[PDB]
Design an enzyme around this catalytic site. Structure first.
Site, PDB file in Angstrom:
ATOM      1  N   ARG A  86       0.198   4.558   2.925  1.00 20.82           N
ATOM      2  CA  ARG A  86       0.250   4.262   4.349  1.00 20.82           C
ATOM      3  C   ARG A  86       0.673   5.443   5.213  1.00 20.82           C
ATOM      4  NH1 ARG A  86       3.943  -0.726   4.739  1.00 20.82           N
ATOM      5  NH2 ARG A  86       4.461  -0.276   2.523  1.00 20.82           N
TER       6      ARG A  86
ATOM      7  N   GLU B 242      -4.896   4.355 -10.610  1.00 15.20           N
ATOM      8  CA  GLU B 242      -5.752   3.188 -10.417  1.00 15.20           C
ATOM      9  C   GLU B 242      -6.972   3.239 -11.325  1.00 15.20           C
ATOM     10  OE1 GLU B 242      -5.896   1.819  -6.019  1.00 15.20           O
ATOM     11  OE2 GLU B 242      -5.782   4.010  -5.924  1.00 15.20           O
TER      12      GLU B 242
ATOM     13  N   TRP C  44      -8.993   6.785  -0.576  1.00  9.87           N
ATOM     14  CA  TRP C  44      -9.278   7.583  -1.759  1.00  9.87           C
ATOM     15  C   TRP C  44      -8.288   7.166  -2.837  1.00  9.87           C
ATOM     16  CZ3 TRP C  44      -7.893  10.258   2.800  1.00  9.87           C
ATOM     17  CH2 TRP C  44      -6.531  10.592   2.885  1.00  9.87           C
TER      18      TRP C  44
ATOM     19  N   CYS D 189       0.839  -1.195   0.000  1.00  9.79           N
ATOM     20  CA  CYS D 189       0.000   0.000   0.000  1.00  9.79           C
ATOM     21  C   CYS D 189       0.871   1.241   0.000  1.00  9.79           C
ATOM     22  CB  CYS D 189      -0.934   0.017   1.222  1.00  9.79           C
ATOM     23  SG  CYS D 189      -1.885   1.564   1.289  1.00  9.79           S
TER      24      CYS D 189
HETATM   25  C1  HEM Z   1      -6.100   6.782   1.909  1.00  8.33           C
HETATM   26  C2  HEM Z   1      -5.667   6.700   0.642  1.00  8.33           C
HETATM   27  C3  HEM Z   1      -5.072   5.389   0.061  1.00  8.33           C
HETATM   28  C4  HEM Z   1      -4.345   5.329  -1.064  1.00  8.33           C
HETATM   29  C5  HEM Z   1      -3.954   6.506  -1.984  1.00  8.33           C
HETATM   30  C6  HEM Z   1      -3.975   3.952  -1.286  1.00  8.33           C
HETATM   31  C7  HEM Z   1      -3.232   3.486  -2.343  1.00  8.33           C
HETATM   32  C8  HEM Z   1      -3.065   2.170  -2.703  1.00  8.33           C
HETATM   33  C9  HEM Z   1      -2.696   1.668  -4.017  1.00  8.33           C
HETATM   34  C10 HEM Z   1      -2.442   2.506  -5.276  1.00  8.33           C
HETATM   35  C11 HEM Z   1      -2.624   0.342  -3.951  1.00  8.33           C
HETATM   36  C12 HEM Z   1      -2.295  -0.575  -5.145  1.00  8.33           C
HETATM   37  C13 HEM Z   1      -3.613  -1.300  -5.396  1.00  8.33           C
HETATM   38  C14 HEM Z   1      -3.827  -1.687  -6.831  1.00  8.33           C
HETATM   39  O1  HEM Z   1      -2.976  -1.322  -7.679  1.00  8.33           O
HETATM   40  O2  HEM Z   1      -4.860  -2.356  -7.107  1.00  8.33           O
HETATM   41  C15 HEM Z   1      -2.958  -0.066  -2.594  1.00  8.33           C
HETATM   42  C16 HEM Z   1      -2.996  -1.339  -2.074  1.00  8.33           C
HETATM   43  C17 HEM Z   1      -3.462  -1.655  -0.801  1.00  8.33           C
HETATM   44  N1  HEM Z   1      -3.999  -0.783   0.141  1.00  8.33           N
HETATM   45 FE1  HEM Z   1      -3.922   1.189   0.120  1.00  8.33          FE
HETATM   46  N2  HEM Z   1      -4.505   3.181  -0.260  1.00  8.33           N
HETATM   47  C18 HEM Z   1      -5.190   4.034   0.589  1.00  8.33           C
HETATM   48  C19 HEM Z   1      -5.873   3.622   1.731  1.00  8.33           C
HETATM   49  C20 HEM Z   1      -5.847   2.383   2.297  1.00  8.33           C
HETATM   50  C21 HEM Z   1      -6.510   1.993   3.530  1.00  8.33           C
HETATM   51  C22 HEM Z   1      -7.383   2.991   4.384  1.00  8.33           C
HETATM   52  C23 HEM Z   1      -6.250   0.676   3.717  1.00  8.33           C
HETATM   53  C24 HEM Z   1      -6.671  -0.252   4.871  1.00  8.33           C
HETATM   54  C25 HEM Z   1      -7.289   0.215   5.955  1.00  8.33           C
HETATM   55  C26 HEM Z   1      -5.411   0.207   2.622  1.00  8.33           C
HETATM   56  C27 HEM Z   1      -4.911  -1.068   2.433  1.00  8.33           C
HETATM   57  C28 HEM Z   1      -4.332  -1.542   1.264  1.00  8.33           C
HETATM   58  C29 HEM Z   1      -3.968  -2.924   1.008  1.00  8.33           C
HETATM   59  C30 HEM Z   1      -4.133  -4.117   1.989  1.00  8.33           C
HETATM   60  C31 HEM Z   1      -3.441  -2.978  -0.222  1.00  8.33           C
HETATM   61  C32 HEM Z   1      -2.887  -4.230  -0.938  1.00  8.33           C
HETATM   62  C33 HEM Z   1      -3.995  -5.206  -1.299  1.00  8.33           C
HETATM   63  C34 HEM Z   1      -3.366  -6.449  -1.869  1.00  8.33           C
HETATM   64  O3  HEM Z   1      -2.375  -6.978  -1.278  1.00  8.33           O
HETATM   65  O4  HEM Z   1      -3.870  -6.928  -2.920  1.00  8.33           O
HETATM   66  N3  HEM Z   1      -5.224   1.272   1.785  1.00  8.33           N
HETATM   67  N4  HEM Z   1      -3.205   1.084  -1.867  1.00  8.33           N
HETATM   68  C1  LIG Z   2      -8.175   1.110   0.524  1.00  7.67           C
HETATM   69  C2  LIG Z   2      -7.664   1.290  -0.889  1.00  7.67           C
HETATM   70  C3  LIG Z   2      -7.529   2.555  -1.441  1.00  7.67           C
HETATM   71  C4  LIG Z   2      -7.064   2.667  -2.760  1.00  7.67           C
HETATM   72  N1  LIG Z   2      -6.915   3.883  -3.334  1.00  7.67           N
HETATM   73  N2  LIG Z   2      -6.768   1.562  -3.484  1.00  7.67           N
HETATM   74  C5  LIG Z   2      -6.896   0.323  -2.965  1.00  7.67           C
HETATM   75  C6  LIG Z   2      -6.586  -0.801  -3.737  1.00  7.67           C
HETATM   76  C7  LIG Z   2      -6.701  -2.074  -3.178  1.00  7.67           C
HETATM   77  C8  LIG Z   2      -6.442  -3.315  -3.960  1.00  7.67           C
HETATM   78  C9  LIG Z   2      -7.587  -3.895  -4.493  1.00  7.67           C
HETATM   79  C10 LIG Z   2      -7.546  -5.053  -5.248  1.00  7.67           C
HETATM   80  C11 LIG Z   2      -6.321  -5.651  -5.481  1.00  7.67           C
HETATM   81  C12 LIG Z   2      -6.278  -6.917  -6.308  1.00  7.67           C
HETATM   82  C13 LIG Z   2      -5.002  -6.974  -7.136  1.00  7.67           C
HETATM   83  N3  LIG Z   2      -5.160  -6.131  -8.333  1.00  7.67           N
HETATM   84  C14 LIG Z   2      -5.162  -5.077  -4.959  1.00  7.67           C
HETATM   85  C15 LIG Z   2      -5.214  -3.911  -4.193  1.00  7.67           C
HETATM   86  C16 LIG Z   2      -7.163  -2.208  -1.872  1.00  7.67           C
HETATM   87  C17 LIG Z   2      -7.483  -1.091  -1.108  1.00  7.67           C
HETATM   88  C18 LIG Z   2      -7.350   0.175  -1.653  1.00  7.67           C
END
Ligand code: HEM
Ligand SMILES: Cc1cc(N)nc2cc(-c3ccc(CCN)cc3)ccc12
Ligand code: HEM
Ligand SMILES: Cc1cc(N)nc2cc(-c3ccc(CCN)cc3)ccc12
Ligand SMILES: C[C@H](O)[C@H](O)[C@H]1CNc2nc(N)[nH]c(=O)c2N1
Ligand SMILES: C[C@H](O)[C@H](O)[C@H]1CNc2nc(N)[nH]c(=O)c2N1
Ligand SMILES: [Zn+2]
Lengths: 411, 407
Positions: free
Chosen positions: B109, B283, B278, B106
Site C-alpha cells: 500500500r 506469491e 506487481w 495488502c
Molecule cells: C503494486 C504492488 C502490489 C503489491 C506488491 C501487493 C502485494 C500484496 C500481497 C502480497 C497480498 C497478499 C495476497 C495473497 O497472499 O494472495 C496483497 C493483498 C491485497 N492487495 Fe495488494 N499488492 C500490490 C498492489 C495492489 C493494488 C494496486 C491493489 C488495489 C488497487 C491491491 C489490493 C489488494 C487487496 C484488496 C488485497 C487483499 C485481498 C483479500 O482480502 O483477499 N494491491 N497485496
Molecule cells: C493487486 C495485487 C497485487 C499483488 N501482487 N497481489 C495481489 C493479491 C491479491 C489477492 C488475491 C487473491 C486472494 C485470495 C486469498 N488467497 C487474496 C489476495 C489481490 C491483489 C493483488
C-alpha cells in the site's frame, strides 16, 4: 451458537462449541481486531463463583457431576472462602488445573502432550532456599539426561498480593547479556536488563557470551535471593552443522531445557504467581528467534559471510538461506547429542492432529494463529492454511508484570 | 479508545485514532477473535453518500464549503429521485485510491496514491469489457515496467444487471483433472477451467495454458474471450546456479490482476473492477509453486538437489523453498519485469505504516496476511503489532457468479 473453521488445503471443516464455555475477554471488539497485540488482590465476593465453575469442571471430567462428593466439596470450599477469604485445592484439583491450563494455552503448538505433564506440588515451600531446591529437582527431572520430560512446579498461591512467590527470571535457564560501553552487547541481548539486576544483587558475572544466569527467587513477598544452578544440572548442546565444518568455529551452544518461569497460573480463582514449567524445544525457537532475530544473537550475517552469499541486495535471499542452514545445524546438534527437540514440520503436523482431536472430543480447541504458525517457512507447514478460533478458557497461564516494577523492597 | 501499537524489534510505539472512524465490522467479539478466518435501498444510501462526500471534501480542504454543501444537496436530490447516484470522476479516482489505501491485507500500500484509474462506466457489452480489459493489461504491463491500475465497470443497479468478470485474475493458468489421479495445470483453477470448457472453451490441455476471459455485462450470460498472447507477458523460470532448473519447464506471468472483488464507494457497488500491481516474489514461489493444493513441485525440486527427503528434520522442504524463491526473483529481474522481494516489500510497508500514523492517525493492517509466507520473523512486519479494522471505501469479497447468476 455454532462456529465452523475451514482448512483451506484439505477442505476439512470443523465445528466449535467450546467457545461458549469462554469467560475472559480477548481484547477484540466488533470494530477492531487486536489479534496481533502481544499483551492486550481479589475478594471473597467474586471468588466462590470462580471456584464453583472450576469444581463443576473438575467433577464433570471425573464423571462425578452432582455427586455427593461434588456437593460436599462445593460446601467445604464455600465455608473456607467465607471464613478464611481463600481456599486450598486438593492435589487432584491442582494436577487437573495445571494440565488444563496448558491444554487451554491458545498460543502453544505443543499441546498434543498436555496430558503428560509431571506436576510438582511445592505449596509447602516457605523460603527462597526452599524454592531453589524445588527448582533444582525440577531441572533434573525435566532434563532426564537429554530425554526431556514436561514438568511444572507450583509454589504457594497469592494471598493478599503482599506475600507473592515469584521467580524473577523469565526462564529458569538463560544466558546473560552485557551492554558494552561502545554500544554493542555481549551474550544474549534479550537478557541485558535482567543481567544488570543480577549484578546489582551481587552476582559476580563471568562476562562471557554464554553465561548461565543465576536464579533470582522471591518467597512470601521477601526480597529476592541469588542462587547458582549447579552446572552439572544445565545440559547444553554445542551447535555444529552436518556439512559445514566451519560452523563449529562460531563457538555457539544452546541449553536443552526451555522452562518458562514468569507466568501466572490461574485455577478456580486462585493465582499461582510462581509456577515454572518446561517442555522441550521446537527447533525454530532457537535457530530462528534466539539466533537470528535482529534483537538477539544476530549471527545471520556471520553465517552468510562464511557461506559466501551475495549479501549486496536482499533479493538474493541470503538472509533466508543462512536462516535455513542455522536451523538445520540446531536440529542436527540436538539429535546427535540425543537431546529431545522437534522440528517445526513435525510439531505443526502433530498440532493439527491434536486440534482435530480436540474438536471431536472437546468441541473446540482455542488457537492463536499469529503464534501457532512457525517463524519460518510458514505456508509449507499445515497450520498456515488452518483457520483457527481464539478465545480464553480457564484454567489458564497469564502474563504478569515484571516483579522489579511492582516489588516493595524490604532492604 | 486511543490505541497503541508497539514494534518489539525497535520499541517504536504508534498511537491509533483512525479506528474510531471504522464503520463496518470485523467478525471478532470480546469473547472470540476470528482474525484467522479468511472470509466474513433508498434508506441506507444517503448516509453512506454523506460520509463518503464528507471524507472527500475534507481531503481537498473544502469541508463545509460552498462546493461541499451543494454537492451533498445535489447527491441527495438524485437519490430521492433515482434511488441511486453517480460519482464525479474526481470522487471516483479518490474512492478507488482509498479502497486500496484501506486494504488491511495488502502489504504493497505504500504505492496507494499512484493508482491509474480507468473509468469504464460507459461500457455496455462483454466485447466492450474485453476491450477495456485488454487496454488495462497492456497499460499495466508496460513492457515489464509494471504500473498499478484499476478499471471500473458500471455500478450495480438492482442486482439483476451486474457487471462481472468470472475469472479470479485476468491471467491464470488452466487446471485440468485426470483419468489418472491428481491434476495437470493449476489445481486452484480446476473448477473454473471446467466452467470454461463447459461454457465453450477449447482447452489446449497443456500445463501453462492462459485461461480465456469470461465476461458478463449488464447481467447477461458471460462470454469467452482469448487475451491476445502478445499482451500476456510471461517469465521463464531459471536458477542463477542450478542449470537443471530450466528443465523443470516452469514459467509464470508477470501481471497480477485480481478481478473478482467488489469496490464499494459512498454506498455504490462496483461488481467488476479488476485491479493490478506487481508481484511479491513469494506469491509465485512460496504459494503458487509449493502449496500442496497448487503446483506442489517441492518434492521434485528437492530430488534434483539430492537432499535427504527421508526426515522432515533435514529441512529439505525449507532449503528447496528458498531456492525456488531465489530463482523466481532472479528470473523476473533478469527479464526486467517488475517484482519485489518480501524483505523489501515488508520494509516498505513499515515505512508506509509510519507515514499513515503520522499523517493520517493509523493504518488498518491484517498481521495474518501482511507477514510473508516464508522467513516470517526475519522480516520487520513480524515484530510489528497491527490493528485490524474496516474502513470505507473498500474492496470486498463477493460470491462467485455461477452460484448466483440467474442463467
Ligand atoms: C503494486 C504492488 C502490489 C503489491 C506488491 C501487493 C502485494 C500484496 C500481497 C502480497 C497480498 C497478499 C495476497 C495473497 O497472499 O494472495 C496483497 C493483498 C491485497 N492487495 Fe495488494 N499488492 C500490490 C498492489 C495492489 C493494488 C494496486 C491493489 C488495489 C488497487 C491491491 C489490493 C489488494 C487487496 C484488496 C488485497 C487483499 C485481498 C483479500 O482480502 O483477499 N494491491 N497485496
Ligand atoms: C493487486 C495485487 C497485487 C499483488 N501482487 N497481489 C495481489 C493479491 C491479491 C489477492 C488475491 C487473491 C486472494 C485470495 C486469498 N488467497 C487474496 C489476495 C489481490 C491483489 C493483488
Ligand atoms: C512439550 C514441548 C512443548 C513445545 C515443543 C512447545 C512449543 C511452544 C512454542 C514454540 C511456543 C511459542 C513460543 C515462541 O515461539 O515465542 C509455545 C508457547 C507456549 N507454551 Fe508450549 N511448548 C511445549 C510445552 C509446554 C508446556 C509443558 C507448557 C505448560 C505446562 C506450555 C505452555 C505454553 C504457553 C502458556 C505458551 C504461550 C506463552 C505466551 O502466551 O507468551 N508449553 N509453546
Ligand atoms: C513450555 C515451553 C516449551 C517451549 N518449547 N517453548 C516455550 C515458549 C514459551 C514462550 C517463550 C517466550 C515468549 C515471548 C518471547 N518470544 C512466549 C512464549 C513458553 C513456554 C514454552
Ligand atoms: C507483534 C507480533 O504479534 C509478535 O511479534 C508475535 C508474533 N507471533 C509470535 N509467535 C511466536 N511463536 N512467538 C513470538 O514471540 C511471536 N511474536
Ligand atoms: C488459514 C489462514 O487464515 C489462510 O491460510 C490465510 C493465512 N494468511 C495468508 N496470508 C496471505 N498473504 N495470503 C493468504 O492466502 C493467506 N492465507
Ligand atoms: Zn480479533
Amino acid at each position: 451458537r455454532f462456529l465452523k473453521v475451514k482448512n483451506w488445503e484439505t477442505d476439512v471443516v470443523l465445528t466449535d462449541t467450546l467457545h461458549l464455555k469462554s469467560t475472559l475477554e480477548t481484547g477484540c471488539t466488533e470494530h477492531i481486531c487486536m489479534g496481533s497485540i502481544m499483551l492486550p488482590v481479589r475478594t471473597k465476593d467474586q471468588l466462590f463463583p470462580l471456584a464453583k465453575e472450576f469444581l463443576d469442571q473438575y467433577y464433570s471430567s471425573i464423571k462425578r457431576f452432582g455427586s455427593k462428593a461434588h456437593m460436599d466439596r462445593l460446601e467445604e470450599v464455600n465455608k473456607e472462602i467465607e471464613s478464611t477469604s481463600t481456599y486450598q485445592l486438593k492435589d487432584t484439583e491442582l494436577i487437573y488445573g495445571a494440565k488444563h491450563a496448558w491444554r487451554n494455552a491458545s498460543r502453544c503448538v505443543g499441546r498434543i502432550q498436555w496430558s503428560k505433564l509431571q506436576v510438582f506440588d511445592a505449596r509447602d515451600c516457605t523460603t527462597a532456599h526452599g524454592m531453589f531446591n524445588y527448582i533444582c529437582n525440577h531441572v533434573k527431572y525435566a532434563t532426564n539426561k537429554g530425554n526431556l520430560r514436561s514438568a511444572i512446579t507450583i509454589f504457594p498461591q497469592r494471598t493478599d498480593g503482599k506475600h507473592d512467590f515469584r521467580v524473577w527470571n523469565s526462564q529458569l535457564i538463560r544466558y546473560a547479556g552485557y551492554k558494552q560501553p561502545d554500544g554493542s552487547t555481549l551474550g544474549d541481548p534479550a537478557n541485558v536488563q535482567f543481567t544488570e539486576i543480577c549484578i546489582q544483587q551481587g552476582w559476580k558475572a563471568p562476562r562471557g557470551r554464554f553465561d548461565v544466569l543465576p536464579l533470582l527467587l522471591q518467597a512470601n513477598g521477601n526480597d529476592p535471593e541469588l542462587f547458582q544452578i549447579p552446572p552439572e544440572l544445565v545440559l547444553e548442546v554445542p551447535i555444529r552443522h552436518p556439512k559445514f565444518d566451519w560452523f563449529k568455529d562460531l563457538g555457539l551452544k544452546w541449553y536443552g531445557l526451555p522452562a518458562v518461569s514468569n507466568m501466572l497460573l490461574e485455577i478456580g480463582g486462585l493465582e499461582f504467581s510462581a509456577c515454572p514449567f518446561s517442555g522441550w524445544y521446537m527447533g525454530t525457537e532457537i535457530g530462528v528467534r534466539d539466533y537470528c532475530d535482529n534483537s538477539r544473537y544476530n549471527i545471520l550475517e556471520e553465517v552468510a559471510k562464511k557461506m559466501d552469499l551475495d549479501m549486496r541486495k536482499t533479493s538474493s535471499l541470503w538472509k533466508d538461506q543462512a536462516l535455513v542452514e542455522i536451523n538445520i545445524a540446531v536440529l542436527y546438534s540436538f539429535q546427535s547429542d540425543k537431546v529431545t527437540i522437534v522440528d517445526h514440520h513435525s510439531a505443526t503436523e502433530s498440532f493439527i492432529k491434536h486440534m482435530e482431536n480436540e474438536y471431536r472430543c472437546r468441541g473446540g480447541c482455542p488457537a492463536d494463529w499469529v503464534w501457532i504458525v512457525p517463524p519460518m517457512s510458514g505456508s509449507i507447514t499445515p497450520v498456515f492454511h488452518q483457520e483457527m478460533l481464539n478465545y480464553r478458557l480457564t484454567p489458564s497461564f497469564e502474563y504478569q508484570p515484571d516483579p522489579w516494577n511492582t516489588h516493595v523492597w524490604k532492604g
